[PDB]
């Protein structure tokens, strides 16, 4: 009776917040969004996202990285694969462009645990953890991964955002501040027997 | 890039739901169930509860075994564990206590997924995915487990219960109807690989 997976936690203060040029969304609104979704959809099919969740802590609380867009949405590091494209060799690519280092010296990812599944049936907002009822024709398929930090890093945060440390009380039942996916990650968490480093 | 647990799921058609004697809780009433959390909590320490969560399909789709109370509360089978009982031996037992067969033969219950942790702060009803700030001494800890059904078994369900399928969209943002662990099944159970046989 010890089935729990093990994560090394280490404190918020071992890591550096660098910053480097601004990245723009692909999408300047939801119309344009839905749009190009559409247009994708019928040229390649389903989209497939990947989402990476990163936890450090302090005085042995665990915390979520987000990134905010200005003082707007709230998002994790990740974005869409190409077709054919490996779904982890992926999330690293995707979280190299975000938070990867001005200097060009290699992050080192380690992803090891799939955390959930949401799928988009329609090219609209709602997205659920289960295909639902009668829907053959997914439009977007989002998957989360549990990322091992290093002990210490320096991160680079593109100037148009600020990575925040949120404590998992403040996501919790909190739908309406983070939607579905963010606020059910305490749930999604507590699996895991996390060393207070 | 396949990090997900396979899981396989058998027709709900392949089991057998028997009949056998009523089963009573030990609390008969709220007052009741809270007085003798106190008297324990402060004879043996802690709460330690354990439950289990029981998957089939019909035509694909998964649904989550759950007992219902006469036409009252839903619950996981499971319960309370004795001071020094491993939480895997314990959930078995309590298992084989609700489920098991009238005619003695073994049930083979398999257990190697740990899905939560959920924390009670105070005697009272309110429960987290963590221990809450401030909170050194919870009163509960209730740890899940995903249990591998067999491809065919016979249960005997009390008299005074009937054992319901429960397809995950019925759960999926319906606290009201079943709290806050059941209600979030569906995020917790999306990070698995369900074979359909
Ligand atoms: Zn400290
Ligand atoms: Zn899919
Ligand atoms: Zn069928
Ligand atoms: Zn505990």
């Not at 990285?65 to 590091?77: D, I, M, N, R, S």
């Not at 990740?78 to 010296?105: A, C, Y």
């Not at 991964?145 to 919790?172: I, T």
Request: charged share 25%; proline share 8%; hydrophobic share 40%.
């Amino acid at each position: 009776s010890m089935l729990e997976r093990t994560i090394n936690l280490y404190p918020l203060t071992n890591y550096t917040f660098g910053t480097k040029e601004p990245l723009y969304e692909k999408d300047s609104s939801v119309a344009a969004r839905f749009q190009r979704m559409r247009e994708e959809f019928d040229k390649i099919g389903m989209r497939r996202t990947v989402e990476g969740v990163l936890i450090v802590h302090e005085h042995r609380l665990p915390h979520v990285l987000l990134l905010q867009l200005g003082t707007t949405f709230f998002k994790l590091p990740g974005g869409e694969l190409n077709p054919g494209e490996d779904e982890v060799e992926g999330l690293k690519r995707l979280m190299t462009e975000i938070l990867g280092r001005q200097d060009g010296v290699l992050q080192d990812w380690v992803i090891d645990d799939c955390i959930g599944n949401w799928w988009r049936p329609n090219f609209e907002p709602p997205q659920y953890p289960y295909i639902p009822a009668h829907i053959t024709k997914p439009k977007e398929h989002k998957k989360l991964f549990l990322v091992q930090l290093q002990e210490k890093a320096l991160f680079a945060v593109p100037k148009n955002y600020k990575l925040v440390a949120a404590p998992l009380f403040e996501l919790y039942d909190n739908a309406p501040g983070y939607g579905p996916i963010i606020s059910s990650l305490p749930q999604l968490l507590s699996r895991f027997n996390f060393i207070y480093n």
